[PDB]
Design a binder for this molecule. Structure first.
Ligand SMILES: Cc1ccc(-n2nc(C(C)(C)C)cc2NC(=O)NCCO)cc1
Lengths: 326, 268
């Protein structure tokens, strides 16, 4: 290499430690890496930032995938990459995101009921964000309450941001993945959003279950809530790899009493409400009978009073506990 | 099924940052033109474009990965000088990183270096007497410099997708595609991919393919909606490169040309 080149870039390069104050402020320890709440030392910002140290050294598939994708993606409801630091000393990669004080896991935790303006608001921004990613053929692959971040106090008050933190919960996994379908689809994301919506309506994970792709008990719970699919409800259930195993272990008559209406009635939600009717098009067993994100957004549930608010909290006081350090 | 960010070009980092103005490109080139003629600089570009194609072929990577590795290489030396990082080191680094981006995986530390070494020895001994001097730690270091200069812009759009879409629309895939595809490959010998949107390059290559095989597509083209003055600029560069190709003996000239490249200054 040229020496003048090395030293000039070295001199000019922005460093993580120089521009950000983060030691002691570890907010999450994910499978892809550790996440920090980062204050900007250099003057002009009282705004906080989420700083991510990518696990491993160098540019792993994980690192290259995340950088590449999020450097292109731009939507209010998808989480936004502000800056990348490449630290030559130890070959570690750091990513700078906008800090999100809340998430749907801690919000749903706290109410153990949510206002309905808030539920509808939260759902619309998830649908909005997922639609954008889906238009760009970007599948999430693991949507759940802890990946739906919500922005606390400041310029983006109450705005949902969709993320992927990383890490056993098969509670949000569509039944085709339980019957062993090979590929992830857009329909797989939408199932998980239906699960999130039911949970927002009632505070209980709709397909909660105790601790191969096949999972007997996760399936049983789905069937306990939704009832066993009839042939006509899902004609290509027969094409699934674990369909023989399904027919061995299960009997449809076990679930004759069971349906979505009866589960949701039991948790004080009316089955002729627009809320419920959209929930059923989301939680449809057959993926090809499951509506799209665009279609959910057009649903008249979002025209019925009250309308979706831009601010999920609708002006009100944010009563939720802030993030604890680790 | 479809590929990620397929229809996002107009809001893409490619478009918004890596379509450069030509005058700015030729300005930054003047550093290396004190050591090389105009003619000699483009001959290098062709040469290292062939280095990259051979590497990709030895590794059995698809054509889209080779084009992405080429665009990274071009991006790098569009901004910085040939002395900055040895382009012998940069070329296999561009293929390495591109292979991770297009989702074909990490090339093995053994395989990438055996690839580099075997291709320079077999296909390029005319320009390279000595064996491939770099090891994987030099690749890893370079990759870090590559990702920095590109401002982490990794997704690259190319002319191959819109080319297929146009020829499907013509109804001539068997007749015109094989040739049009080959002209698209050849455009990577030039600066075009840093100066025109990939769809426009596609049209230009499709036009040269039509003239070559004598297919009249006058009205199909006029029925499109685009600055034809721009498409004519590209067609002129493509025609130009085939005269350059004709007059250039890569094998009989490149060792001398490589010796004239500016030297990476060492530490004191
Ligand atoms: C390897 C990898 C890990 C995470 C992501 N990723 N993906 C997304 C979507 C929701 C836009 C698809 C977001 C992210 N990453 C994050 O949100 N990271 C913040 C803390 O880890 C991408 C790739």
């Amino acid at each position: 290499m040229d020496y003048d080149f090395k030293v000039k870039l070295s001199s000019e390069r922005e460093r993580v430690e120089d521009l950000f104050e983060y030691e002691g402020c570890k907010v999450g320890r994910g499978t892809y890496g550790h996440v920090y709440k980062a204050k900007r030392k250099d003057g002009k910002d009282d705004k906080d930032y989420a700083l991510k140290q990518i696990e491993g050294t160098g540019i792993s598939m994980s690192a290259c995938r995340e950088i590449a994708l999020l450097r292109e993606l731009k939507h209010p409801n998808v989480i936004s990459l502000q800056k990348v630091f490449l630290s030559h000393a130890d070959r570690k990669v750091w990513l700078l995101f906008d800090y999100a004080e809340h998430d749907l896991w801690h919000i749903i935790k706290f109410h153990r009921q949510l206002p309905r303006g808030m539920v509808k608001s939260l759902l619309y921004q998830i649908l909005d964000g997922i639609h954008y990613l889906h238009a760009n053929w970007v599948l999430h692959r693991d949507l759940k309450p802890a990946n739906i971040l919500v922005m606390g106090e400041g310029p983006e008050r109450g705005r949902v941001k969709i993320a992927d933190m990383g890490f056993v919960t098969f509670w949000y996994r569509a039944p085709e993945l339980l019957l062993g379908a090979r590929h992830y689809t857009k329909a797989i994301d939408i199932w998980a959003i239906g699960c999130i919506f039911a949970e927002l309506l009632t505070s209980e994970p709709i397909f909660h279950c105790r601790q191969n792709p096949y999972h007997h008990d996760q399936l049983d719970r789905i069937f306990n809530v939704m009832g066993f699919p009839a042939d006509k409800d899902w004609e290509d259930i027969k094409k699934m790899p674990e369909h023989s195993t399904l027919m061995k272990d299960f009997r449809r008559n076990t679930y004759t009493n069971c349906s979505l209406i009866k589960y949701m009635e039991k948790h004080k939600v009316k089955p002729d409400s627009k809320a419920f009717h959209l929930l059923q098009k989301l939680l449809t067993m057959d993926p090809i009978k499951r509506i799209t994100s665009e279609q959910a957004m057009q649903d008249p549930y979002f025209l019925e009073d009250p309308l979706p608010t831009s601010d999920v909290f609708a002006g009100c006081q944010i009563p939720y506990p802030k993030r604890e350090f680790l | 099924d479809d590929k990620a960010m397929a229809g996002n070009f107009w809001q893409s980092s490619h478009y918004l940052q890596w379509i450069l103005d030509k005058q700015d490109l030729l300005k930054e080139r003047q550093k290396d033109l004190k050591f090389l003629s105009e003619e000699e600089y483009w001959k290098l570009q062709i040469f290292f474009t062939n280095v990259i194609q051979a590497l990709g072929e030895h590794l059995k990577l698809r054509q889209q990965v080779i084009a992405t590795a080429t665009v990274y290489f071009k991006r790098f030396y569009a901004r910085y000088s040939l002395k900055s990082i040895d382009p012998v080191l940069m070329a296999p680094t561009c293929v390495f990183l591109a292979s991770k981006v297009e989702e074909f995986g990490v090339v093995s530390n053994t395989r990438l270096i055996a690839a580099a070494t075997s291709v320079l020895k077999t296909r390029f001994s005319y320009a390279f007497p000595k064996e491939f001097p770099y090891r994987m730690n030099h690749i890893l270091e370079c990759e870090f410099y590559l990702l920095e200069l590109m401002d982490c812009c990794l997704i690259v759009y190319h002319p191959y997708r819109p080319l297929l879409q146009y020829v499907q629309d013509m109804g001539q895939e068997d007749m015109l595609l094989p040739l049009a595809w080959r002209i698209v490959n050849d455009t990577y010998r030039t600066d075009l991919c840093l100066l025109y949107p990939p769809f426009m390059i596609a049209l230009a290559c499709l036009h040269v393919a039509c003239v070559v095989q004598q297919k009249d597509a006058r009205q199909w083209f006029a029925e499109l909606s685009v600055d034809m003055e721009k498409i004519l600029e590209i067609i002129r560069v493509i025609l130009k490169l085939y005269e350059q190709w004709k007059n250039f003996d890569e094998r009989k000239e490149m060792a001398t040309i490589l010796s004239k490249m500016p030297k990476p200054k060492p530490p004191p």
